[PDB]
Amino acid sequence: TGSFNFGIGYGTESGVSFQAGVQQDNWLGTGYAVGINGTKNDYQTYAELSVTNPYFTVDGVSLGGRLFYNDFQADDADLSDYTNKSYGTDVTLGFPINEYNSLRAGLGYVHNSLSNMQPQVAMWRYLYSMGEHPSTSDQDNSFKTDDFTFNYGWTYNKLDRGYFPTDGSRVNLTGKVTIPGSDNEYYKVTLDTATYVPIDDDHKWVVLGRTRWGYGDGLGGKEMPFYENFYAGGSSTVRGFQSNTIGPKAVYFPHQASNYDPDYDYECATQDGAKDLCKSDDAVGGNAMAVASLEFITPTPFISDKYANSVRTSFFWDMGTVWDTNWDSSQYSGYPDYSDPSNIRMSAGIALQWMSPLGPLVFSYAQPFKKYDGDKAEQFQFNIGKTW
């Protein structure tokens, strides 16, 4: 039978999150599981319709299709400001290679409608590569693209259990490339790994090694769109840093602020006296990213053996860098070199996780030990629920 689901969560990364949806396995006897779901948090509203048949072949090759919509406000994600309203569709074949591996191959279409972009160097450099030349002194602008992509994926999952793993690894590799006829011309690859190594026979002392890598670039003279950038920093990547703070910072052009009021703060506003380019501490992401973490899981102090399996205590060293391979350092010698991958941020901290009756609760306290100009710290972080 059909089912409805409604959830509410909260975290330092995304604020209050609302989730609503409907799902029906074998909807109307078609053999397709059909779902309609939406999510809303501080910076994004996302909705999707999905239809998937787990047995497109008798050997478990799956066929799935999706329709989706995204409304995103970048200032609400602690980035330099822009609005993106996007939508599209995709079709994906999933192949179970063996017990622990699956491969995915699909085709996608996506329309992106960018507007309210606050003028800044890296973003205008991408726009220029597309033949778009909006004004540098106003936030009233528009840029739309239509892209078609080939999408591929690989997931390896041999984690020993679905919650609090003590052994095994989970690896996810995702890639895509535009198909000729798309407005953009680029490729993009993301790799995530989590490996757990138990030390004791009882698996109460475990070492987790975690990595995340991202790399994308334009084909030809076009750059990868800034709306496909990678980010780092926050409760789920490099703990102890404010969400998305790591890496390049916007270099703003002097502009007349859309709704000026001397009661609020603005970046490079002409009304404040701005007549030249302004350095800032607003993150913009980058086309290259790497994160690494070593985390030592220990027994939880002053807790009962009966309720030990419900709580996880851990101590970690997190590391992260994000960079812009197309940053022109020679042209912007008076600004930090945002193309430099060696500005590795580091933090050390502790985390407490509880698989409570209501759901997963995660708290962390971490201190940056290595940071750069413009990076913002957020020592205490937490998340309640399954959305981050």
């Binding site: 996302y46 995204n70 993106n84 599209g88 984690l159 995340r212 789920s236 399954k386």
Partner: peptide, 15 residues
């Protein structure tokens, strides 16, 4: 999970 626009990031805490 965490979304970065339309991209997905499986958070290790969910594993």
């Amino acid at each position: 999970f965490r979304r970065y626009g339309l991209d997905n990031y499986w958070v290790x805490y969910c594993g």
